[PDB]
């Protein structure tokens, strides 16, 4: 803290694009540190200050240890020739595991063309596939040919039978069997144990998705009459880029990782072809204004692409994208496909009419790509990397294992001890009278406080038993040994989360959430016991500490409706973000503390788009007013509360 | 096949002769085998192997020929693929008996439930639906000219299609008049609605509206003239006003359904015409009209399957003219229109549909509505425990052959082999359908064929497969590229309730729906979670239909009272000046409040007052039934109420049960034990027999103590004859009406816990079909005079399918207060005699007996201690704080206390019998009764706890009572008996000291008397007189078994039978004990089981009641059997299926606490009946007495050491006591010390 206070040019390091090349010397030392010691010192500094670059910094750490060229073989095309000619035993099938919607058998066909080897390619769908695959393997096990089975994840039991057949096989020294499959946990574990694994991911980027989309569609369909349809296909291809890379940026790009696959593209091409054949009636040219834009927008926002969409906000996002792209204005030569790319640049749509001009423009795309291509802010990339940065560290926490014998429980004794010492021992319960049933907020707080007290008792008894195990006081039960292994790897067990809980989150942030949650529950329980029911409105309630906030919203609605004698269908919502300290609450106003605004800054109930990832909102006064039948102003935006 | 149906022989004569020869050979061979059943003798018959192989080949030939004949018939008439095997042999074998063919039409066609025939059964004149909707054929089918079954079945299908098309043409020709008239006569419209069927009415309305809108758009021409669209909108608004005025009258339910469907369709027409007018659409080829669903009728088409073409976006379909009867119309929400768009886009792309989402969002009903609107046969296959794989290949063949639709609700719930096999078949069918894409290539369909069940099956282009999924999850990988998914995460409930209310004649259907829809979500969130609460969309729809019925009832009542007076009655006028929120709150309360628990009813009323401000619900006053309830409850010593009194809630619950019997024919009482549910139905029955003057018969059956093969009957596995079960005998006795039983009203009450196994056959009669089927094959219809009832403690193991069909009443514990129990006890004791036996029980007066007067005086004495804030209630609420070996049920302690006070008045009568010179005077009576009440409260509450809690309860009683307790400082009050005089007598003074001989020093039949055994012996002597089933528990070795045996053998009339229970005790143990000791004798009152030893009361010792094992459902068969003997005074003989009664039978039992590993806790319906005593270890004083006696017995061999007897035993006790302080069970489970050591 003293060194970061004393340093003058620290600030340019704080917002640097790649600060890990210029980490400042701040650590106090007595002997001159080694290059690897300097590397771990700057690694800790990068982890502390700017974790977004942290993964990249980890690469430089490997550059300090095992050479600069260590990961240099990844970003090269895969050397299949040397591996299948030298490194693969003929009784070992080569497993090619790709993601769904992606294929890698073209590599096999290219290798079979290059090495001059005959290949029997068989896709498997039924028992005829069983018979043909067994006949092909029984002939090529003597002839020494090459046999590929494609999409073999569909029949796992027959794959178990095939592996048991292959274990007793004595093949020719150049017979090679490939099994190409999707990455799916329906595969047996022993085939991945007894095979050569290869992972084939598509290259990330908008441009590569456009190349794959344009390669998928035949040229004979695209080059049909009328001439405008290919232009539309380019727009359709752009649409299949413009959300799929957005699927890389969950939860900011979409609420969940939807299954926007190849069949959506094929159905979109089919409905575009059918509508253009119904509209043009075979003519060579039609007007851009006579294209049924509403038909395409509706059938691709509701039928083709929107069927997988369940959230209405993602449906609104898809409809805004479709209304921003699939118009007649896109046919104009001055259309910007992506505005404010890197703040000031823009992406203009090419003016060609034939397909090859579009392919040339797509090939002439710049190799630099920012999230502003998709409409996202650039700092979302700054989010996404550091999300994966967390996904590094906990994974290494999974790899701690137990092997240091010739101190896991030696650390875990103190870990469970301080986790016991953090949380209070006993949470008090609220007293049950009749006069606080007329106040629904007390019903909320009692439904909160039993759930909190039971989870407190559960965590306390489990941590007490774990710290008994760490001194040898207790015999290792299956539940206790599983719990102590989960605590070694630092993962949340299933038997610990019992309310609406964030997924994929570790145990230390979990126990910090208990500290804040039952601290807030103890404070509101003491206030409810002391001041009576009337204090229950004036207290500032954090919605994140409650196990259910929609009950709080409905309880505030009921409190207003009972206080002023109005029907529950008549009230509507209003939010005022006040910033002056000690703002006096009104009759229908309830104080909410600790909300976060992602992507904007609010001043005087007025939002402005900002490049900060999050801003801590002050005490929000949530008010319930009468449903006036006023037309909504165009300057009013509906935001979701997650 | 060759003997069950007699007409299969004439169809296959060669196979009949062949099977006759084969049967002759096989019976001769089997007679030769039956001569010698030795295995080596069967192996040594001459030429037996060649003959067996020849017979096997011949039987295989007959089977192959018959299977090919059945497959030929199934390929002839394609709907034969939808029927089972033996049903198909029944259908073809009953060609000359057409009526037997009538029951199979429901599985075959969509709505054709029967066929209307000639009087001679030679012409099939027409067809009918399930709901009585009928169609006469335009051309009749003459079955004499077409005697083959498949021939006249194809003719029936073709003529139904022809008649449906011609009637649709005439209906649209007549309704095009009403489409263009600004003024509509109600009478001609009602004549049109009553003339034609509901699907034809909705179809003609849709076709006429679509044609008029298309003609209006052609007349618009892009000139900006919105006048004809306004004209069509005004016409449909005029029809809305005409139909909403017509639905407010009194209508038959068929025409009410037709008007409801018409309102539901035409309101959507009004909304879409409003949207079309608002969006300023001027061209007929605009997408805002193309995306809406369109119809085009061509009467000039000769082909009867394409006279109506239904189009939506790019998709077009031809109307299959399948009879659907009267289905349920779906409210066309935006979600429904989006579903229609997605599924029609997937069907035009030759794909399949996957509407995925949570349960209850109208997925499968939307698929069914889409299939019905296009008029195709839809078949919903449930993917939860009703998944037969033996017929689903045949079902897929029928779907591909005749052309139909298939829906699979909850495909996520299937297991792996089901999912793999069905997904492979569906994948193969969908790939065959995707071959129909690219018709330019498919100019030759080459009669398209698919691989199914290892054969080749032709595929119709009108067929479709739909899969419904429940995520939370993704589709199987065989079909993920073949199906189009659609998220139904939330349907629009507000529009559904708006159209449902507006179809029920409600004038203000917007604000009322906007109130009621969030109220159900409020009830689902704010109320505590219960497994029988239903806040779903189906319950909301039922609530709205019931609200329409309540409004119609109020309108009819106003019309009747205005008819009686002299006033002019207009239905619109009396419907105008009338509140609708009161109707909705009345229907909501009258549906929901009987299911509510007592803790959540003021939360429900708070929510209901918040949603509906200032609206209150008033319970319907039934004054005559309440007067008969007052008479019956005053007859049977029961407290009464009239709302917010001591007993009002029980009368409210029994009135709710009366209304549920009026509404639902299957009902349950579902509250906890001891809350009045078991006799409230008898009170209602014996009040209805006085109010209506109709005889009431009740049949109480225990469902779990009697096996399913005994309850419903089992068929003979060989030599097949049908044996009736208990329920089937009851129903057969009702339906035969030999004794005129159908004139009376009969109630069958299944007094026992609910379980899915014995109710699955009851589901076929518990639904609206009301038809019980049997393995015999009889189809029995339940008469309307019968009402199936249930009595269950909880629904811990109740399936949803049975609980959805039954109206329920929750009889909570706070319905019954303790004051009602005290009133029942005092009013029983002031009127019943305790010496009458059985003769005067039918006789239920001042000078009847002196014992009645002395118990009346005792009641007068003990009444001030029986108040709400007196002694007994405070002792009960303090004893509920005490822990016991089992759960302290309130009614158990109260019944035990009442029995012991009965024994107190019996003791007073014994004093007056032994001293006839002067009676029991009032002061000594007051002292005896007031001391005995303290003694009886102490025993009846703290007889199930340790000595420290006996001392604690005695201290609390001493602090809160006025009666003087004995002065002695360190002796608890539980050791002082109340004497027959007014003073306390110590038990230590009452125990004798006996000396036992040397020959039996540790014999298992002798006992040494001490304080504890004489106390417990007096307690069993009190409890055994009134035949209460007594149970003693405690740690092992405490001596309960032989104390019970010695006290039972000491009584001169108790004949003791010692039975032992383990984890394999069926009721056959008790039945064999009754067959060994008792006998059945018939009397004109009824058959009765009695012991052979006349005058001796038989007692069944069962040594370990806890030891029978619980089932999968928390039930014990023998314990429920003993419970029904104690509660009902008898059981059922399954061989004759007749009620027997126990005459001189008791039950006593011993136990161990249920914290022991081999024990199970007892049922709360059985724990109410039993008074339970906790037998502790005897303690140091009792053991010094016992083993001082035993060592003085032992030291008679050696005569020089008498004086070393007594100093030994104390030491022999004392060290043992420190073992009981040192070697605890927690250190090691075998560190157990008892007097057995």
């Amino acid at each position: 803290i003293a060194k970061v206070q004393a340093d003058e040019q620290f600030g340019i390091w704080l917002d640097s694009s790649s600060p890990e090349q210029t980490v400042p010397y701040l650590w106090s030392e007595e002997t001159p540190a080694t290059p690897i010691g300097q590397a771990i010192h700057r690694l800790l500094l990068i982890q502390a200050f700017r974790p977004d670059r942290l993964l990249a910094m980890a690469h430089m750490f490997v550059s300090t240890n095992l050479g600069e060229s260590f990961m240099s073989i990844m970003e090269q095309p895969l050397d299949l020739t040397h591996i299948v000619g030298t490194e693969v035993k003929p009784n070992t099938p080569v497993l090619m595991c790709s993601v769904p919607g992606y294929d890698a058998s073209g590599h096999v066909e290219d290798l079979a063309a290059e090495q001059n080897t005959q290949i029997t390619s068989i896709a498997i769908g039924s028992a005829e596939g069983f018979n043909q695959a067994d006949k092909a393997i029984n002939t090529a096990v003597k002839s020494g040919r090459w046999v590929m089975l494609k999409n073999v994840h569909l029949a796992p039991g027959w794959l178990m039978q095939l592996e048991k057949k292959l274990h007793s096989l004595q093949p020719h020294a150049c017979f090679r069997l490939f099994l190409t499959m999707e990455i799916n946990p329906k595969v047996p574990v022993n085939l991945l144990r007894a095979g050569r694994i290869f992972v084939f991911e598509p290259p990330p980027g908008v441009k590569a998705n456009m190349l794959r989309t344009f390669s998928s569609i035949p040229v004979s369909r695209i080059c049909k009459s009328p001439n405008e349809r290919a232009r539309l296909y380019f727009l359709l291809a752009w649409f299949h880029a413009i959300i799929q890379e957005r699927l890389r940026y969950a939860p900011l790009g979409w609420s969940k990782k939807y299954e926007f696959g190849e069949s959506d593209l094929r159905s979109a091409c089919d409905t575009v072809d059918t509508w253009l054949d119904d509209t043009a009636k075979g003519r060579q040219n039609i007007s851009p204004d006579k294209i049924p834009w509403s038909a395409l927008k509706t059938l691709m926002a509701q039928s083709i692409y929107g069927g997988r969409v369940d959230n209405e906000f993602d449906q609104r996002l898809l409809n805004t994208f479709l209304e921003r792209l699939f118009t007649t204005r896109s046919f104009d030569s001055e259309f910007k496909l992506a505005c404010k790319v890197d703040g000031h640049k823009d992406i203009q749509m090419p003016d060609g009419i034939r397909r090859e001009e579009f392919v040339q423009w797509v090939e002439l795309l710049p190799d630099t790509q920012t999230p502003s291509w998709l409409g996202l802010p650039n700092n979302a990339e700054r989010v996404l990397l550091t999300t994966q940065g967390v996904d590094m560290i906990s994974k290494m926490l999974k790899m701690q294992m137990l092997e240091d014998e010739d101190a896991w429980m030696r650390t875990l004794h103190t870990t469970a001890s301080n986790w016991l010492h953090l949380i209070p021992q006993t949470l008090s319960h609220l007293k049950r009278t009749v006069e606080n049933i007329k106040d629904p907020l007390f019903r909320f707080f009692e439904r909160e406080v039993k759930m909190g007290a039971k989870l407190l008792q559960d965590v306390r008894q489990d941590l007490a038993d774990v710290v008994q195990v760490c001194e040898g006081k207790k015999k290792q039960t299956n539940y206790l040994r599983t719990l102590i292994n989960e605590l070694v790897k630092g993962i949340l067990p299933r038997s610990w989360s019992h309310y609406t809980v964030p997924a994929g989150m570790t145990v230390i942030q979990w126990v910090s959430d208990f500290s804040e949650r039952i601290k807030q529950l103890q404070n509101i329980s003491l206030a409810a016991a002391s001041g009576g029911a009337k204090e229950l409105k004036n207290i500032h309630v954090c919605l994140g500490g409650l196990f259910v906030p929609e009950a709080y919203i409905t309880a505030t609605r009921q409190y207003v409706a009972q206080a002023n004698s109005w029907s529950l269908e008549e009230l509507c919502l209003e939010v005022n973000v006040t910033t002056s300290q000690g703002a006096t609450l009104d009759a229908c106003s309830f104080g909410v503390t600790g909300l976060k605004l992602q992507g904007a800054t609010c001043n005087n109930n007025k939002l402005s788009l900002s490049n900060a990832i999050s801003t801590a909102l002050p005490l929000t006064q949530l008010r319930w007013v009468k449903q006036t039948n006023t037309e909504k102003k165009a300057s009013v935006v509906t935001l979701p509360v997650y | 096949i060759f003997t069950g149906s007699a007409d299969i022989k004439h169809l296959l004569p060669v196979e009949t002769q062949e099977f006759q020869s084969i049967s002759t050979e096989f019976l001769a061979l089997m007679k030769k085998v039956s001569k010698s059943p030795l295995v080596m003798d069967v192996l040594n018959i001459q030429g037996v192997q060649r003959s067996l192989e020849r017979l096997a080949d011949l039987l295989g030939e007959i089977q192959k020929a018959l299977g090919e004949y059945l497959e030929r018939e199934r390929s002839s008439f394609p709907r034969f693929y939808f029927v089972g095997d033996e049903d198909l042999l029944e259908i073809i074998g009953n060609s000359k008996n057409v009526a037997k063919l009538q029951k199979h039409f429901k599985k075959m066609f969509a709505g054709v439930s029967s066929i209307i025939l000639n009087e001679d059964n030679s012409v099939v004149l027409g067809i009918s639906s399930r709901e009585g909707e009928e169609v006469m054929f335009k051309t009749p089918v003459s079955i004499t000219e077409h005697p083959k079954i498949n021939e006249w079945l194809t003719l029936v299908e073709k003529e139904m299609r022809v008649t449906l098309a011609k009637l649709l043409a005439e209906s649209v020709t007549e309704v095009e008049i009403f489409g263009k008239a600004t003024s509509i006569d109600p009478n001609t419209y009602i004549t049109w609605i009553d003339k034609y069927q509901a699907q034809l009415v909705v179809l003609s309305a849709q076709i006429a509206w679509s044609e008029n809108v298309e003609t209006a758009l052609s007349s618009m021409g892009g000139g900006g003239d919105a006048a004809p669209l306004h004209s069509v909108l005004s016409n449909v608004e005029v029809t809305l006003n005409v139909l909403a005025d017509s639905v407010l009258m009194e209508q038959p339910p068929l025409r009410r359904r037709k008007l409801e469907h018409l309102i539901t369709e035409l309101v959507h027409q009004r909304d879409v015409t409003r949207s079309l007018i608002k969006s300023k659409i001027d061209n007929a080829k605009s997408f805002e009209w193309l995306s809406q669903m369109r119809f085009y009728f061509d009467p000039k088409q000769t082909d009867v399957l394409q006279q109506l073409s239904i189009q939506m976006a790019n998709a077009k379909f031809n109307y299959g003219f399948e009879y659907l009867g009267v289905q349920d119309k779906l409210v066309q929400t935006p979600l429904t229109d989006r579903c229609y768009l997605t599924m029609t886009q997937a069907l035009e792309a030759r794909l399949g549909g996957s509407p995925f989402g949570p349960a209850g969002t109208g997925k499968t009903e939307s698929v069914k509505a889409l299939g019905h609107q296009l008029g195709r046969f839809v078949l919903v296959f449930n993917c939860d425990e009703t998944f037969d794989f033996q017929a689903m290949g045949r079902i897929f063949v029928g779907l591909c052959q005749v052309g139909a639709w298939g829906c699979f609700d909850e495909f996520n719930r299937l297991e792996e082999r089901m999912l793999s096999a069905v997904s492979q078949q569906v994948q193969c069918i969908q790939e065959a359908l995707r071959e129909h894409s690219n018709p330019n290539y498919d100019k030759t369909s080459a009669p398209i064929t698919c691989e199914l069940l290892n054969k080749q099956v032709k595929v119709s282009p009108d067929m479709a497969i739909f899969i419904t999924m429940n995520p939370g999850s993704n589709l199987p990988d065989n079909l993920k590229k073949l199906f189009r998914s659609l998220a139904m995460t939330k349907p629009d409930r507000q529009l559904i309730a708006q159209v449902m209310l507006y179809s029920q004649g409600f004038r203000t259907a917007e604000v009322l729906a906007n109130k009621i829809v969030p109220f159900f979500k409020l009830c689902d969130e704010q109320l505590s979670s219960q497994s029988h609460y239903d806040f779903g969309l189906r319950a909301l729809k039922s609530v709205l239909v019931s609200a329409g019925n309540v409004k119609r009832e109020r309108i009819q009542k106003i019309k009747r009272e205005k008819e009686e007076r002299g006033e002019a009655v207009d239905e619109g006028e009396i419907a105008e000046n009338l509140p609708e929120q009161e109707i909705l709150i009345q229907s909501v309360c009258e549906t929901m409040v009987p299911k509510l628990v007592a803790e959540d009813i003021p939360l429900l009323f708070s929510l209901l007052s918040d949603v509906f401000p200032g609206v209150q619900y008033h319970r319907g006053e039934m004054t005559a039934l309440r007067e008969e309830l007052k008479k019956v409850c005053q007859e049977m010593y029961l407290t009464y109420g009239d709302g917010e009194e001591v007993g009002g809630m029980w009368v409210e619950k029994v009135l709710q049960l009366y209304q549920i019997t009026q509404i639902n024919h299957g009902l349950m009482m579902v509250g906890p034990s001891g809350s009045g549910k078991s006799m409230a139905w008898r009170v209602l029955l014996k009040a209805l027999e006085r109010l209506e003057g109709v005889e009431g018969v009740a049949h109480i059956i225990d469902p779990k103590a009697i096996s399913k093969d005994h309850l419903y009957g089992t068929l003979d596995p060989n030599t097949r004859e049908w044996t009736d079960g208990l329920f089937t005998h009851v129903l057969r006795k009702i339906i035969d009406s030999v004794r005129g039983e159908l004139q009376k009203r009969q109630w069958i009450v299944f007094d026992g816990d609910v379980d899915p196994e014995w109710v699955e056959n009851l589901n076929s009669v518990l639904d609206d079909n009301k038809l019980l089927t049997l393995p015999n094959g009889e189809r029995l219809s339940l008469p309307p005079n019968v009402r199936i009832m249930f009595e269950v403690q909880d629904l811990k193991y109740a399936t949803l399918a049975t609980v959805s069909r039954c109206g329920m009443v929750w009889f909570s514990e706070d319905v019954l207060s303790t004051d009602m129990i005290f009133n029942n006890f005092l009013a029983r004791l002031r009127s019943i005699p305790l010496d009458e036996g059985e003769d005067e029980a039918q006789r239920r007066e001042e000078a009847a007996s002196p014992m009645l007067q002395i118990q009346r005086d005792a009641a007068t004495i003990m009444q001030p201690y029986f108040t709400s804030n007196g002694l007994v209630t405070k002792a009960l609420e303090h004893a509920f704080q005490l822990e016991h070996i089992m759960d302290l049920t309130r009614l158990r302690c109260l019944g035990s206390l009442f029995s012991m006070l009965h024994q107190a008045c019996r003791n007073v009568a014994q004093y007056n019998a032994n001293h006839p010179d002067f009676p029991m005077q009032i002061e000594q009576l007051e002292r005896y009764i007031q001391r005995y009440l303290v003694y009886a409260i102490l025993w009846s509450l703290s007889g199930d706890s340790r000595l420290k809690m006996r001392a604690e309860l005695g201290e609390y009683i001493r602090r809160i009572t006025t009666v003087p307790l004995p002065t002695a400082p360190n002796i608890p009050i539980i050791d002082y008996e109340v004497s027959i005089s007014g003073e306390w007598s110590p038990w230590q003074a009452k125990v004798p000291q006996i000396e036992v001989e040397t020959h039996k020093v540790a014999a298992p039949d002798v006992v040494v008397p001490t304080l504890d055994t004489v106390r417990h012996e007096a307690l069993l002597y009190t409890w055994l007189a009134e035949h209460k089933p007594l149970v003693l528990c405690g740690p092992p070795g405490s001596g309960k078994t032989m104390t019970l045996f010695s006290a039972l053998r000491a009584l001169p009339d108790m004949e003791v039978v010692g039975l032992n229970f383990s984890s394999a005790t069926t009721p056959e143990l008790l039945l064999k004990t009754f067959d060994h000791y008792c006998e059945y004798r018939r009397t004109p009152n009824g058959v009765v089981l009695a012991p052979v030893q006349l005058g001796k009361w038989l007692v069944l010792f069962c040594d370990e009641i806890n030891l029978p094992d619980m089932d999968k459902y928390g039930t014990q068969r023998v314990i429920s059997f003993i419970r029904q003997m104690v509660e009902h005074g008898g059981f059922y003989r399954t061989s004759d299926q007749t009620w027997v009664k126990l005459e001189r039978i008791q039950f006593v039992g011993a136990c161990n606490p249920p914290t022991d590993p081999g024990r199970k806790p007892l049922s709360h319906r059985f724990l109410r009946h039993v008074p339970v005593v906790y037998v502790d270890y005897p303690g140091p004083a009792s053991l010094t007495q016992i083993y001082g006696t035993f060592n003085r017995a032992m030291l008679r061999l050696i005569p020089s050491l008498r004086t070393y007897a007594e100093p030994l035993t104390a030491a022999m006790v004392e060290f043992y006591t420190m073992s009981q302080e040192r070697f605890t069970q927690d250190t090691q489970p075998h560190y157990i010390y008892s007097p057995r050591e």
Side-chain angles (χ1 to χ4, degrees), chain A residues 184 186 267 275 294-295 298-299 302-304 306-310 315 437 443 554 558 562 567-569, chain B residues 287 314 338 341-342 345 356 424 477 484-487 489 511 514-515 522 525-526 603 606-607 610-611:
Chain A
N184 200 288
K186 208 148 69 215
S267 297
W275 272 97
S294 86
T298 313
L299 281 180
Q302 294 193 10
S303 151
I304 306 301
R308 292 143 167 84
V309 185
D310 43 10
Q315 178 79 57
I437 317 294
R443 314 181 224 165
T554 319
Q558 276 200 67
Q562 196 263 358
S567 176
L568 205 67
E569 74 106 10
Chain B
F287 191 67
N314 314 101
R338 176 210 211 173
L341 178 67
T342 53
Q345 279 289 294
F356 76 104
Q424 209 277 337
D477 314 343
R484 172 78 33 82
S485 91
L486 168 82
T489 176
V511 202
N514 219 334
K515 268 139 177 297
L522 259 295
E525 281 172 27
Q526 299 270 316
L603 316 176
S606 150
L607 289 198
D610 270 347
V611 170

Side-chain angles (χ1 to χ4, degrees), chain A residues 444 447-448 451-452 455 492 494 496-505 510 513-514 517 543-551 641-642:
Chain A
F444 184 22
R447 203 128 58 223
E448 275 293 293
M451 176 33 153
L455 204 35
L492 163 75
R494 165 71 215 108
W496 267 34
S497 87
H498 304 308
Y499 58 93
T500 325
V501 158
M505 71 76 57
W510 184 235
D513 200 5
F514 294 82
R517 267 178 199 269
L543 252 69
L546 319 163
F547 313 127
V548 65
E550 55 256 63
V641 177
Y642 281 135

Side-chain angles (χ1 to χ4, degrees), chain B residues 830-848:
Chain B
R830 271 189 233 275
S831 168
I832 211 73
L834 289 198
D835 83 286
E836 50 93 22
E838 199 47 276
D839 166 55
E840 273 83 7
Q842 58 96 22
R843 268 193 76 254
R844 305 274 80 79
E845 52 94 24
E846 320 112 318

Side-chain angles (χ1 to χ4, degrees), chain B residues 354-361 363-364 382-384 408-414 467-476 486 488-489:
Chain B
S354 154
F356 76 104
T361 61
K363 309 173 276 212
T364 81
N382 177 39
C383 307
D384 287 307
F408 289 84
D409 36 355
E410 272 162 343
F411 217 67
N412 264 126
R413 287 300 148 271
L414 285 171
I467 283 198
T468 316
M469 291 265 288
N470 215 329
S473 291
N474 305 306
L475 224 41
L486 168 82
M488 311 215 179
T489 176

Side-chain angles (χ1 to χ4, degrees), chain A residues 230-322:
Chain A
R231 178 172 266 231
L232 258 176
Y233 262 75
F234 165 70
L235 274 162
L236 208 163
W238 178 261
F239 183 50
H240 202 84
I242 212 55
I243 61 165
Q244 271 210 334
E245 266 290 329
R246 277 285 268 272
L247 281 173
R248 278 188 53 241
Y249 287 93
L252 221 70
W254 296 83
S255 55
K256 59 197 84 183
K257 297 177 116 296
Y258 295 105
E259 44 269 9
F260 294 134
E262 174 179 26
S263 149
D264 304 315
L265 246 177
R266 300 209 76 205
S267 297
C269 290
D270 288 319
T271 184
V272 154
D273 281 351
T274 318
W275 272 97
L276 265 152
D277 275 343
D278 204 42
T279 316
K281 297 302 197 318
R283 265 177 296 274
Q284 178 85 356
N285 293 318
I286 53 147
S287 160
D289 293 286
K290 262 162 70 63
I291 289 164
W293 296 110
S294 86
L296 306 187
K297 270 192 280 175
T298 313
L299 281 180
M300 202 165 47
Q302 294 193 10
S303 151
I304 306 301
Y305 268 50
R308 292 143 167 84
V309 185
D310 43 10
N311 207 309
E312 61 149 52
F313 284 79
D314 303 351
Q315 178 79 57
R316 181 193 68 195
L317 185 128
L318 196 87
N319 253 303
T320 48
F321 264 134
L322 281 196

Side-chain angles (χ1 to χ4, degrees), chain B residues 219-263:
Chain B
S219 160
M220 276 205 43
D225 188 28
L229 258 189
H230 268 305
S231 171
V232 176
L233 178 67
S234 183
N235 181 79
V236 81
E237 192 66 34
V238 154
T239 325
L240 262 41
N241 285 339
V242 160
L243 266 189
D245 293 349
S246 197
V247 80
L248 268 180
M249 325 283 288
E250 170 63 80
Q251 309 283 341
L254 189 50
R255 205 202 293 157
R256 172 138 281 123
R257 206 87 45 80
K258 294 179 169 185
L259 280 35
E260 226 187 328
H261 287 3
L262 263 184
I263 288 297

